[PDB]
Amino acid sequence: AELDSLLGQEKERFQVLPGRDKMLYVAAQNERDTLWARQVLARGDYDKNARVINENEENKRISIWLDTYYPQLAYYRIHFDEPRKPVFWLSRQRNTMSKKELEVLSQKLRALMPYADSVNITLMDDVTAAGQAEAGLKQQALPYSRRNHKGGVTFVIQGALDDVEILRARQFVDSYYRTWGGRYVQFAIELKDDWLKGRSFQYGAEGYIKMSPGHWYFPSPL
Amino acid sequence: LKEPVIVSKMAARKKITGNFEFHDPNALLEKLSLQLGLIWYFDGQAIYIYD
C-alpha cells in the first residue's frame, strides 16, 4: 500500500516528498495535521521509513545547526511555500560574506534537507524590515515606543489598553511573525496599570512624589 | 550644619522619605525650603525653621 492512501480521504492537506537517503517526508502545515500524520506512522501501518516535517519545526532544526557551525550570522527566515526549493532570506547590510562563501553555505544547507533540491539564498534590505513594522504599527493607532540599537530594534507597547487594541495588536504581531520571524525586530506588548497609581508628582530632573498632603518621597527623577 | 536647628510645632507635622546626602547643607536647605514650603532664619547661634 502507498503512503498517500494511508492518510485521510482529503488528498490535499499533505504532500509526500521522496528523500535522498531512502526516506519519505510528509509535509504538514500545522500542529494538528502534524499529530494526524504522526499517529499513522507511530501506530505502525507502514513497512518503510518515513518522517513528518513542518515549517515551524524545520525552521528551528536548521537554526540549531546554524548557530554552532555558522555563528555571528544575520538572517531572518526560511520559506517553504515550495518544499522542493526553500528560500533563505539573508540580511544585506549586516554580513561580510562573498559569493564563494555563499555557494558553500548553499551547499551545506542542502545536506540538512534531503527532500529539497536547491536552496536559493536571497538578500534583503535591513531598513524595510523595520519600516513595515512601524507602518503596520501606525495603522492600528497603537501607542508605541521605538528603541533603535545595533543588530535589532524594539517596539514597546505599554499602558492600559482596551479590548479592541489588544486584539488588533495581536492580529498584527502574528501576521508579521509569520513572514519575517523574530530575529531582528521584536514587539513587547505589556499590559500594566498606571505607574504612580493615584499619586501626584512633579516630574523632570528634580522629582518627588506626594504620598500624602503632608508627605514627600524622593526616588529617582520622575 | 555647625549650629543646632530648632523646628516649630506646625512645621514638624510634615514627613520626608528618601536617601539624602549633605555635601553642602546651606545650599541644600534653600532648595528643600522651597520645595516643602518653609521659612528659616539663622541668628548667629541657631537655625530656626517655621512653615
Partner: peptide, 21 residues
C-alpha cells in the same frame, strides 16, 4: 522639562509646588 501632575489636589499643595519656579 519640569511640570506638575495634579490629581484632585487641594490648591495649597498645588501652589506650594510652584514655589520653586
Amino acid at each position: 522639562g519640569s511640570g506638575f501632575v495634579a490629581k484632585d489636589d487641594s490648591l495649597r499643595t498645588f501652589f506650594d509646588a510652584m514655589a520653586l519656579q
